[PDB]
Antibody, heavy 217, light 207 residues
Framework: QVQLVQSGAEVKKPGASVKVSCKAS????????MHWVRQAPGQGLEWMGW????????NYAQKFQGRVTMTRDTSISTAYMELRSLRSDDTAVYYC??????????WGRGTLVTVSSASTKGPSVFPLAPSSKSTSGGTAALGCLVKDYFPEPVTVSWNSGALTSGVHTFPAVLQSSGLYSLSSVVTVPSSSLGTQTYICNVNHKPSNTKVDKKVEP | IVLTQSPGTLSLSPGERATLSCRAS???????LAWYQQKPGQAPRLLIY???SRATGIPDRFSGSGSGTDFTLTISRLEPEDFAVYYC?????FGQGTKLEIKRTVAAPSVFIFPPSDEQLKSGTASVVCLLNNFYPREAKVQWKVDNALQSGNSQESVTEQDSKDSTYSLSSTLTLSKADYEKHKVYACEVTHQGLSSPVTKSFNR
């Protein structure tokens, strides 16, 4: 199988450096250039550079010259991208892509690199209680508020994944505090508020935080 | 340095024909234009190379065509899997991306408001949440009013991806205040506007 496997997500302070790895398999690693493309959350794709795995020769985008270094280790078919002097706007998913010429036909799954002065922190989970203010027709709305965590991502399930219909989990927002926040909501029949319990399950792996929060009227 | 794609957003129903445009840069040759698809949480996926040749495995409803600087990606019959973001590429230059969304009938939002929890108030902060549920199109406006005074700069909003079942959007707007500020005021309200609403909808509560 033809595959590119990248190293895990990183969390860095501004001014630090990160080295991402990209191991190829299923093809001759030295017969194709390897490119690095990054994508900031909610934004477009940005080409960084390429490396010729057979020569080590490189070519970097102008805005990365002197900060980035791409290398390879053919004995283990791995490509490396080191970005130094990290700044917050370097927060992005970094992809390695095989260069079938200038066509990127094989991609890695990406590596999230977060650059912020914030320290890893688990979320506070607060209920968004239902009431008359959250009732329309026979349909009520309830949710959980996952506030002040760093870095991305968090996952939210309801009743351990037994409740899926009507669920809306919003993309995280980066608050001016440097911490993230999101809410998860679900609409249910207003008659089941007295018979069916509702628990949101929040998991924030980066800080190994697991919180179950019962949401009551 | 960034290629131009049009439109920014294309709204169509499944089974319709989609045409996306990309204007290559004149400084560099255009014979090597490529198109990519990207779905949420996934790496981009090569669709078209050489301006008009399909990548392996790509269904034949995708086709490419191009002159010297104007290139087009055509999807003949949109399947529900085809709605995503599409990028063009020319050497080291990527396009700004075009989002292909499902077009449905206009649906006005259902507005709900949530006060802060007593738990959060114990810590010294108060978050008020205004929920706009299952609406279309994506454009909406939320205005916060505390004791009938317009707020600004203390709210952030988030929007879901298009719902896979009913193709609607949902929007969250969170007003953040300190406990002290929150307890100085009485009425908290969010006013919602949307092309499906004949008049603004207001939801409020009394601390």
């Amino acid at each position: 199988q033809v595959q590119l496997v990248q190293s895990g997500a990183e969390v860095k302070k501004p001014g630090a450096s990160v080295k991402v790895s990209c191991k190829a398999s299923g093809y001759t690693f030295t017969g194709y250039y390897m490119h690095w493309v990054r994508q900031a959350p909610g934004q477009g794709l940005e080409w960084m550079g390429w490396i010729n795995p057979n020569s080590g020769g490189t070519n970097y985008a102008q805005k990365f010259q002197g900060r980035v270094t791409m290398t390879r280790d053919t004995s283990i078919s791995t490509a490396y991208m080191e970005l130094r002097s990290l700044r917050s706007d370097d927060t992005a998913v970094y992809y390695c892509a095989r260069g079938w010429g200038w066509y990127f036909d094989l991609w890695g799954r990406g590596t999230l690199v977060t650059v912020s002065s914030a320290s890893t922190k688990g979320p506070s989970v607060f209920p968004l209680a239902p009431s008359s203010k959250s009732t329309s027709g026979g349909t009520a709305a309830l949710g959980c508020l996952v506030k002040d965590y760093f870095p991305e991502p968090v996952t939210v399930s309801w009743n351990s994944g037994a409740l899926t219909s009507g669920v809306h989990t919003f993309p995280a927002v980066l608050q001016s505090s440097g911490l993230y926040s999101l809410s998860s909501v679900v609409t249910v029949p207003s008659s089941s508020l007295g018979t069916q319990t509702y628990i949101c399950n929040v998991n924030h792996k980066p800080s190994n935080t697991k919180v179950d929060k019962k949401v009551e009227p | 340095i960034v290629l131009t794609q049009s439109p920014g957003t294309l709204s169509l129903s499944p089974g319709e024909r989609a045409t996306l445009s990309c204007r290559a840069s004149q400084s560099v040759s255009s014979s090597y234009l490529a198109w990519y698809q990207q779905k949420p949480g996934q790496a981009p996926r090569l669709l078209i190379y050489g301006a008009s040749s399909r990548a392996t495995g790509i269904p034949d409803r995708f086709s490419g065509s191009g002159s010297g600087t104007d290139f087009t990606l055509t999807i003949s019959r949109l399947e529900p899997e085809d709605f995503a973001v599409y990028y063009c590429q020319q050497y080291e230059f990527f396009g700004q991306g075009t989002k292909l969304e499902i077009k449905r009938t206009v649906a006005a939002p259902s507005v709900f408001i949530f006060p802060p929890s007593d738990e959060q108030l114990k810590s010294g902060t108060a978050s008020v949440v205004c929920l706009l549920n299952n609406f279309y199109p994506r454009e909406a406006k939320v205005q916060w009013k505390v004791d009938n005074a317009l707020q600004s700069g203390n709210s952030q909003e988030s929007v879901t991806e298009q719902d896979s079942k009913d193709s609607t959007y949902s929007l969250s707007s969170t007003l953040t205040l300190s406990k002290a500020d929150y307890e100085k005021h009485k009425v908290y309200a969010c006013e919602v506007t949307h092309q499906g609403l004949s008049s603004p909808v207001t939801k409020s509560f009394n601390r």
